[PDB]
């Protein structure tokens with residue numbers, strides 16, 4: 001008589017009513033809405049609904065007969081039978097999977113929350129119980145590094161291909177390809193054009209090895225790629241309620257085994273939507289985080305109902321983070337260029353510039369003009385123009401023709417457009433910035449049989465996830481930019497054991513040859529003590545050699561993986577090196593700076609000693625470089641460094657230890673070796689160094705072939721010389737600063753791929769002290785050891801006692817400060 005329970009929509013005698021007319025009259029029973037209406041609009045049971053008379057319009061049932069008819073709401077057992085929800089159960093380990101027939105290989109589900117910045121879980125974890133329990137019981141990293149630009153289509157497509165955007169071709173939501181003379185838009189028919197989507201998404205990889213796939217939304221899953229769609233896919237429709245997407249994937253997981261997928265995707269637009277609309281710190285984002293947390297709960301609760309919660313491997317992930325934009329932190333190019341109508345500028349933090357007249361002027365247009373026009377125009381300028389090949393190599397953002405030849409690097413929180421007309425609300429949340437900025441860092445949680453429990457893994461890159469998902473599905477990965485085995489530490493039972501790459505030809509020898517003590521045109525500083533008997537000073541005892549190797553190559557010698565290549569090892573007291581007869585230059589030197597080693601200020605300009613182990617060549621003489629305006633030289637192993645005296649190490653002045661070096665770059669090189677290397681040595685109680693030249697004329701992140709390099713020599717004073725595109729440096733100390741680099745239990749690395757440029761316009765040297773800008777340029781141009789390996793054709797640390805997987809982990813690390 002007081003309640004609608006069991007009498008929805010029926011006439012009553014006893015006071016309160018349960019028909020739609022009651023609301024106007026305000027004579028409804030107090031539980032009319034909860035009992036009779038809400039069930040049409042909600043996917044949950046509650047205390048009002050437990051044992052409800054079945055309603056025909058209800059989205060799911062909480063009626064006693066719901067289990068028989070198999071349409072109980074997912075939380076039925078939790079709420080109406082008093083059982084515990086997935087989130088309410090304590091963690092318990094999944095050593096053996098408990099899977100049905102068909103899942104002898106257990107399924108993997110890639111669940112994306114768009115624009116879930118890593119920080120959201122750091123800060124609001126107390127409000128996110130489900131994602132928090134997955135972290136607790138699973139494999140988590142505080143930060144998963146996205147690809148540049150930190151945008152949705154690029155990162156989603158990267159996750160499922162293991163490719164950098166420059167390689168997979170989806171470099172933004174809006175693109176122009178000049179070869180195609182077509183434009184890419186998400187609003188357009190070209191969105192569906194397979195020409196745009198390169199590489200191999202995992203759903204294709206899986207199909208070729210006989211696994212079916214179900215994608216409830218993912219970029220590319222609605223495109224015929226290598227002639228294939230996912231076995232089940234959905235046309236993107238953001239209006240589909242989240243509950244309906246999760247319920248559909250749970251339907252797919254009950255398909256008969258012959259047609260049931262192994263690889264699944266789930267995607268939600270939150271918290272990216274709220275993040276843009278109201279900012280990353282906002283009531284709206286908190287509410288969205290709680291919503292997606294609940295949807296993750298609905299999935300886990302559903303998997304429990306299906307006895308699949310100790311079967312399915314879940315990867316909960318995000319494309320990128322989110323940052324607070326400001327109208328006071330937006331740069332307009334028209335301030336510097338005027339209201340010109342010949343250029344189209346892509347707005348935001350990953351801003352790019354292209355001529356209007358395309359494809360005609362795309363290559364011919366004067367990029368360098370605008371580049372210099374916009375450089376160092378203000379002090380503490382919040383943007384920097386870059387020809388795409390001069391962007392830090394760590395960003396891997398240049399190979400694709402779809403990348404405009406002039407790009408901008410924006411500071412944290414800063415964005416750029418041509419003018420205020422061509423951009424949306426500047427006060428909005430945004431992303432797209434440098435993929436090492438904290439607020440761009442992304443979510444990763446792995447949970448399931450395949451993944452470890454209660455592990456917090458060090459930061460890794462989303463490009464490594466493709467190989468990981470391949471391992472979880474026992475697939476052979478297509479070729480990608482992940483280092484296979486670098487994430488073996490995340491897996492209970494790694495399926496791929498990596499091996500160090502095998503050197504193609506063993507080292508040729510460079511034996512001493514009796515030759516004249518020839519004139520090099522050098523006016524040596526008198527202090528320097530020349531090499532009085534070369535054959536004496538460089539005929540070393542096997543006892544003497546063991547000591548040198550142990551001090552200079554404590555991790556083994558860099559191995560060379562290039563096919564057509566001839567290198568020779570050169571021995572010295574303070575350093576070892578690999579010399580290329582082919583390019584008249586070392587590919588690498590290795591030396592070790594100890595805590596209390598001495599760095600000399602004594603000048604050593606215009607001083608070289610001939611090396612009788614290689615033929616003398618014109619480019620090895622001080623004469624070639626004397627008042628040469630076009631190129632100078634520099635030393636890999638530093639002459640400044642003496643272990644024996646406080647003077648200058650003469651052996652470092654050999655012709656074999658010099659590389660072509662622009663005068664401008666000497667400022668950087670001299671500051672590094674004089675100042676920084678000393679500080680690094682003191683700070684870390686010794687540091688092993690390996691440095692060398694880099695030739696990437698294709699700007700493709702890879703060492704150029706010898707064949708290619710022959711056509712890229714410059715002719716200077718009627719000599720053929722090869723000038724490095726970059727110089728690499730790899731510092732190595734111990735995690736424990738008590739031990740020196742020769743006896744590390746654990747390696748701490750720091751590597752650089754410094755661009756080799758004829759001016760230092762990059763750094764805006766004007767009215768600034770020298771110290772500041774060099775350190776900043778090194779930090780911007782840091783790189784993974786793996787980045788160095790790719791671009792030099794070298795392979796480091798091959799003689800370490802550590803297993804290979806642990807080395808790959810170390811090699812793929814990028815330091816962040």
Ligand SMILES: *[C@@H]1O[C@H](CO)[C@@H](O[C@@H]2O[C@H](CO)[C@@H](O[C@H]3O[C@H](CO)[C@@H](O)[C@H](O[C@H]4O[C@H](CO)[C@@H](O)[C@H](O)[C@@H]4O)[C@@H]3O)[C@H](O)[C@H]2NC(C)=O)[C@H](O)[C@H]1NC(C)=O
Pocket residue numbers: 163164167168198199396479480481700701702790
């Ligand atoms: C990230 O991973 C990617 C995959 O491992 C790497 O990209 C691959 O780079 C190679 C080197 O260019 C490229 O392979 C090809 O080599 C030929 C050049 O010698 C190229 O022409 C070949 O392709 C083809 O030739 C015809 C006519 O030109 C083409 O129409 C056809 O495509 C035919 O197969 C050959 O494929 C790959 O193209 C490329 N893959 C992708 C998807 O980009 C990156 O090197 C790597 N990046 C880093 C920094 O590690």
Ligand SMILES: *[C@@H]1O[C@H](CO)[C@@H](O[C@@H]2O[C@H](CO)[C@@H](O[C@@H]3O[C@H](CO)[C@@H](O)[C@H](O)[C@@H]3O)[C@H](O)[C@H]2NC(C)=O)[C@H](O)[C@H]1NC(C)=O
Pocket residue numbers: 237239240241
């Ligand atoms: C994109 O997804 C949205 C949300 O799922 C779709 O809109 C919804 O469409 C349904 C039916 O497709 C509508 O429901 C009702 O359908 C019955 C059909 O018999 C009809 O009697 C009702 O009057 C009502 O129309 C619903 O109104 C609609 N919106 C909401 C709020 O759920 C949409 O169809 C999808 N497709 C595209 C491409 O937009």
Ligand SMILES: *[C@@H]1O[C@H](CO)[C@@H](O[C@@H]2O[C@H](CO)[C@@H](O)[C@H](O)[C@H]2NC(C)=O)[C@H](O)[C@H]1NC(C)=O
Pocket residue numbers: 181358359360
């Ligand atoms: C490249 O694409 C541009 C833009 O689509 C082409 O310009 C079009 O030319 C056609 C006929 O050739 C005209 O009917 C259109 O009105 C033009 N569109 C626009 C917006 O200008 C251009 O001709 C294409 N081909 C090449 C290789 O330049």
Ligand SMILES: COC1=C(OC)Cc2c(ncnc2N2CCC(CNS(N)(=O)=O)CC2)C1
Pocket residue numbers: 114152186187191217218219220221222234235236238267269270271272273274276
């Ligand atoms: C099925 O594959 C597709 C998708 O898989 C997810 C997404 C998508 C597609 N086409 C156009 N736009 C798309 N979206 C990406 C970005 C996405 C954030 N917008 S938000 N967070 O404001 O609501 C909203 C638009 C196709």
Ligand SMILES: *[C@@H]1O[C@H](CO)[C@@H](O)[C@H](O)[C@H]1NC(C)=O
Pocket residue numbers: 336337338340373374
């Ligand atoms: C840069 O060129 C523009 C034309 O786009 C011109 O308005 C401006 O004066 C130039 N700025 C300079 C010379 O730095």
Ligand SMILES: [Ca+2]
Pocket residue numbers: 695696697698699700701702703704
């Ligand atoms: Ca190259």
Ligand SMILES: [Zn+2]
Pocket residue numbers: 115152272276431
């Ligand atoms: Zn977004």
